[PDB]
Nucleic acid binder design. Structure first.
Length: 602
DNA sequence: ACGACAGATAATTTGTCACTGTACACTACGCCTTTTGTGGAGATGTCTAATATCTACGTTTTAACAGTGGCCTTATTAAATGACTTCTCAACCTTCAC
């Protein structure tokens, strides 16, 4: 996770900002909207959902006739390209989501079929429980990936004895068990799977990507319709209401510049770094950044100047800058939108390209990938692709003469396990795995140190700000706020503390748990309990454990994992994934998480 | 011869009267002992109703709270917020413009 974003304000005189706003809002965003509409109507759309993959070129092909439609014709080539990238990534995202959800629904539907109680397994096997227990002992002795191997063994073995023995073996977590099945805990575990299947089935009714209408013409024409026309029935009037409540999108889609050299850097005579974008060189924007990021923007000019001095004998494949996003940030107050909103550039950089040693890491990664490509790839334009790839492979050998910082060296036998929990967001154990000894624990309080008071602040603000929103909603007041930025701050403080401890003990890796989807587990567990406690009373079921379900939906385990992954990559510490045990305290969970990831190395 | 007539005669008792021996001399029912049935205290032994004491019999009363039972409507779409997921993160070459 070595890619990170740095940002700066872009400043320019009003006519440059107005011209860019009108390009984005009047042409580029309407084009994106049109591409999303046409792409969702394509005759292959239903087979793209089955593959879960979009064709590499279909957005580019749809955009070609639109580039000369009077609605969209006025744009530079890179703005059409940006619109293509926006639309292509949206569907690459959405088709990947739907594909995995469909696989989850199919997987659990098979499990629901093969989850049979011992009373059902007796009939469906025709064998006594001891007989299927012995047959499961044989099938386990052959399947010795074990879970998948049993799922593979189940499907084509139509022999109901072995098929039931696999069912019995899978019910217990791929192992034998002597103890009797508690019939109500089984019936609950069956009911959980039905709820999960239903909730997956409902999630697969997701909407197609909606776009951003900045005119909101549909709202005003619906208002005129609903006020002067009789609704033909309740369903038309409901559709009218649903439109009238829909909020207006203020801001256009950002521009995306996937060619780092489509940002051209310079220093003006007042000494400020400046940038202009390919196709819009007349609009000079001035960089206004914090000094904590200035060294990156200075590097972008130095990388640009280095390759010009070498007459392009360097490769921009090793430019520290990777891509840019050009974004309008919503301004407070009033004005024309190019005056109200603040133009902001977000630059992706790869942190390894800062140093010379890290650049050598990237160079070999580039060289191996391109040598693979050239070997596997072998038309005129496809031969031109090979020649560009071969030019890259030649030019990445030329050095940028970057700062030298020796790479981190961590001991392979020292690991940090990080236990994640709802009550204690992180707990760490430094384990010496060949010694099987814990070198150090730290609690959440020791990780946060002097910041530990922020953790009670978060809980207190989450309560307070929720209640103030609840009160504000009843007044239709816009003053609705929350603690997300404090929560993000805490997760970043924890990430830095964990990695600093890992560096201090020379740990080779940080071990993080494969939590899965905690929210759908908790939500289906609690619903199965509540349906027994409040039969036929839906509101009673939804009130049951409401605050626990809320707490689990706020638990930011993904954001914390992501923050740890970024900080570890910036110091070259390996991340490993392990299985967090359910037994024990957060300290013991962290220790056994660490040691299991060591033993799982094969 | 004996004894047998009437009457003598030696007893026998009746009655006188001088003499003398004696008590009157105040001087026993009184002193003393033992038994003994009746009687007067006065230490001591006899043995109860009863007015408690002295706990328990257990029996009510409380409140605490535990368990049963009724009710609670459910859907769509938009918005805000908090999150999750996915995708992306070229580069050399050509052409026309001073």
């Amino acid at each position: 996770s070595s890619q990170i974003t740095i940002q700066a304000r872009l400043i320019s005189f009003e006519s440059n900002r107005q011209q860019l706003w009108k390009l984005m809002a009047d042409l580029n965003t309407p084009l994106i909207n049109e591409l999303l509409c046409q792409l969702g109507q394509h005759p292959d759309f239903e087979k793209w959902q089955q593959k879960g993959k979009l064709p590499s070129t279909v957005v580019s092909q749809l955009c070609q006739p639109l580039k000369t439609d009077p609605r969209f014709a006025g744009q530079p080539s890179r703005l059409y390209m940006s619109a293509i990238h926006i639309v292509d990534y949206i569907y690459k995202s959405w088709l990947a989501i739907q594909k995995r959800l469909q696989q989850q629904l199919d997987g659990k539907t098979r499990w629901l079929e093969m989850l049979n109680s011992d009373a059902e397994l007796v009939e469906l096997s025709g064998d006594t429980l001891e007989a299927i227990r012995v047959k499961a002992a044989e099938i386990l002795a052959i399947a010795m990936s074990l879970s998948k191997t049993l799922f593979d063994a189940y499907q084509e073995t139509e022999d109901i004895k072995s098929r039931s023995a696999i069912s019995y073996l899978l019910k217990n977590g791929c192992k034998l068990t002597d103890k009797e099945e508690d019939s109500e805990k089984f019936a609950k575990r069956r009911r959980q799977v039905e709820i999960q299947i239903q909730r997956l089935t409902e999630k697969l009714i997701s909407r197609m990507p909606k776009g951003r209408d900045l005119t909101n013409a549909k709202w005003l024409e619906t208002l005129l319709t609903a006020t002067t026309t009789v609704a033909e029935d309740n369903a038309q009037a409901k559709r009218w209401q649903d439109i009238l409540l829909t909020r207006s999108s203020s801001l256009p889609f950002p521009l995306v510049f996937e060619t780092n050299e489509d940002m051209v850097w310079s220093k003006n005579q007042k000494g400020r770094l400046c940038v202009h974008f390919n196709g819009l060189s007349d609009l000079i924007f001035e960089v206004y950044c914090g000094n904590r990021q200035l060294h990156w923007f200075q590097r972008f000019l130095e990388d640009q100047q280095t390759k010009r001095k070498s007459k392009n004998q360097h490769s921009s494949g090793l430019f520290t800058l990777r891509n840019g996003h050009l974004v309008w940030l919503e301004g407070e107050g009033k004005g024309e939108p190019w005056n109200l909103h603040h133009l902001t550039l977000y630059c992706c950089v790869d942190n390894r390209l800062w140093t010379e040693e890290g650049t050598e890491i990237v160079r070999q990664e580039k060289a191996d990938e391109i040598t693979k490509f050239i070997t596997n790839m072998k038309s005129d334009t496809q031969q031109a692709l090979i020649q560009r790839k071969q030019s890259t492979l030649t030019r990445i050998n030329n050095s940028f003469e970057r700062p030298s910082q020796p790479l981190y060296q961590g001991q392979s036998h020292i690991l940090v396990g990080v236990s994640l929990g709802l009550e204690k967001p992180a707990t760490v154990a430094v384990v010496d795995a060949i010694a099987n000894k814990v070198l150090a624990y730290r609690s959440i309080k020791q990780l946060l140190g002097d910041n530990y008071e922020l953790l009670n602040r978060q809980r207190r603000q989450q309560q307070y700000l929720s209640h103030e929103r609840h009160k504000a909603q009843k007044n239709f007041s816009p003053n609705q706020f929350g603690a997300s930025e404090l929560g993000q701050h805490i997760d970043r403080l924890l990430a830095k503390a964990i990695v600093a401890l890992a560096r201090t003990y020379k740990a080779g890796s940080i071990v993080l748990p494969k939590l899965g989807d905690m929210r759908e587990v908790v939500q289906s567990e609690i619903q199965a309990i509540a349906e027994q406690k409040f039969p036929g009373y839906i509101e009673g079921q939804q009130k049951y454990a409401k605050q626990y379900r809320v707490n689990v939906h706020r638990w930011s385990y993904g954001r914390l994992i992501q923050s740890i992954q970024s900080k570890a990559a910036q110091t070259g510490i390996v991340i490993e994934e392990g299985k967090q045990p359910i037994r024990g305290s957060p300290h013991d969970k962290a220790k056994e998480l660490a040691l299991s990831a060591y033993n799982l190395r094969l």
